[PDB]
Design a binder for these strands. Sequence first.
RNA 1: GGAGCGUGCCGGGCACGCUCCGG
Length: 661
Amino acid sequence: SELHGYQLEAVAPALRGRNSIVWLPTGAGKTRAAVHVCRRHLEGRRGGRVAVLVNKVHLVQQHLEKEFHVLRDAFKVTAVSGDSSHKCFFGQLAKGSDVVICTAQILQNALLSGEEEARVELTDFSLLVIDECHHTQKEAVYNKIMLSYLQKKLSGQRDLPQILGLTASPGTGGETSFEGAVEHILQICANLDTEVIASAQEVPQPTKQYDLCQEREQDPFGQRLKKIMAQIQEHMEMPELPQNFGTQVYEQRIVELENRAAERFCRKTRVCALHLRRYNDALLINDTVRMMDAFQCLQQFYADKKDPTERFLATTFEENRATLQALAGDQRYENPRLSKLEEILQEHFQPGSSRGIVFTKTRQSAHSLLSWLQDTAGLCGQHIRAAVLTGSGHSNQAKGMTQNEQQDVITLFRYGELNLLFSTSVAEEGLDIPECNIVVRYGLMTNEIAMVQAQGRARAQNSMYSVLAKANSREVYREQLNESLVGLMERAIRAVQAMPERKYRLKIVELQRNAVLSWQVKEARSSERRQLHDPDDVYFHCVNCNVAVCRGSDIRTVEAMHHVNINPNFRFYYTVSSGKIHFERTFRDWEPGCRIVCSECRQEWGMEMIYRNVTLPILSIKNFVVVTPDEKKKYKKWSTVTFPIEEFSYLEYCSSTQDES
RNA sequence: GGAGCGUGCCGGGCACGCUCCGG
Ligand SMILES: Nc1ncnc2c1ncn2[C@@H]1O[C@H](COP(=O)(O)OP(=O)(O)O)[C@@H](O)[C@H]1O
Ligand code: ALF
Ligand SMILES: [Mg+2]
Ligand SMILES: [Zn+2]
């Protein structure tokens, strides 16, 4: 299959060496077009080196095996893999290759590197191909790489690589006016240093349907959770507490209350707020999947549990546990979201032939939908072979899927060994399954880019796209708005394409200049906030029992990421709990040791890091209240702390530790 | 499981997600 006319046309500017964005519909074959650009680019001058940037782990392998491998007749093409069992540094890999395919953060790491073997410059490439280039916005890695490109361009750096952006959907960036949308397109062009947006000016699409579901007539499971939540809030004895149970707003307010209580050391308020968040999580789960999924959320929280507040809460759950379980087994109170999804799958998987992705928000939700499908008698004998697909995201609630684990599911899905995926947003862009003919979006609240992309996974002739949402909801509204935003985005792109060259050029220079200036201001602002306090005047307190445990001056950063306490006497404040934590990925310089906890109350603090031949405690900031002479604050991220932290030195630490004994 | 980022949401937060951690 040689290139279609539209492909050749879309890459004509790139073939003349112009920076461009190729804007072609989902599944139009932007990738093969880009490969052709790389072939002629590399042919047209020796010494050329191409970087192909992607934004999902599995796209590295997909792009190699289905497209970029054809360049191996004449050129060396390397796909970066986190699973290589002969690992070297990026610079070595890239400098010894004609084409390097990697996730963008791999390149950004190399572009910022200290060590000489790993270091790379933008000038070491003659072409950057940026897949799904609509992510080249704000502080995403695509935009960090390109902001550096702009800085260099504006200072008169020469032989910067050519830029080839690929996307189906620049988006409108929240803008709902023509003027706004046009400005957003220009901002994307500015970010990517685009000379021309090239399209097919001179690919089937699915029939779309709204599968609306009504609120549950009777929800005694949810009602009972709400009654319990009211009881806990009465026990807290506080006026003006929120009543809007089962909402993300209540979730926010109750965690904010939890944080204020942590900051003032209000133990009873904080612990009750903690548990209330869990009950609220259960309501959200109840509204999204099965009652029993919501029950298991609460049950696992209380199974792993003295203090009279915490025993009041244990007692309160125990008093309702059996009733909650029995209600959860009752077919009468089934989730209409799930009934609707059953109808859809019953209709489209009769007779095997259908090849579907059901998109859901959370990793947990994907797993719960699979279990639901496997427990649903109405869907048996339909030859539905389903699996979960998630990305590499990870949390206590739900672990991720590694590169290989993702690839295993995708490869079986490709020819129908599996015929249905329950997927997170990991598979909304880029994934190419020619036989996929059904996409269902299950109660999602996304922008128009995610809508267009997810729809686009249905590659087949006569594909179907279903919006499964609650009737009269914000989800339905946002889907309808998003549809109009696609049309508006298209209008905006056409206006930028027809813009007088001189007016376009002046506008790009202006946006680029403002971008590089705004970055400098943001950087200076971040530095000032970081220098507000002497580290010696910052104390860390255990969030549970409020005991003082270390100071800011005890903290160092290992590998510009991991915040460790280097004080030899800090070991008297934490206790190591048995059980080595195991990650799937093994690192070069370290592995995780055991979890650490507060030695005076057993509150979780973080974990051991076995860094070369020493063991260092990593402190997770969320388990502490940070106290300065001005305020007490609960932090989510280390990056918002207002004292400076020095980089860890291994040599200096080893030297100082071998003094006492 | 630490970090980076994004999306949704609320008047700087909340939630979720993806990515990085020798490729
Ligand atoms: N000229 C062509 N002839 C036949 N098939 C093609 C051609 N160009 C691309 N394809 C195929 O079309 C499918 C979609 O291409 P892909 O690059 O994933 O689309 P996107 O533009 O969304 O990245 C792939 O299976 C690809 O191999
Ligand atoms: F790049 Al696409 F669907 F637009 F994989
Ligand atoms: Mg693609
Ligand atoms: Zn403690």
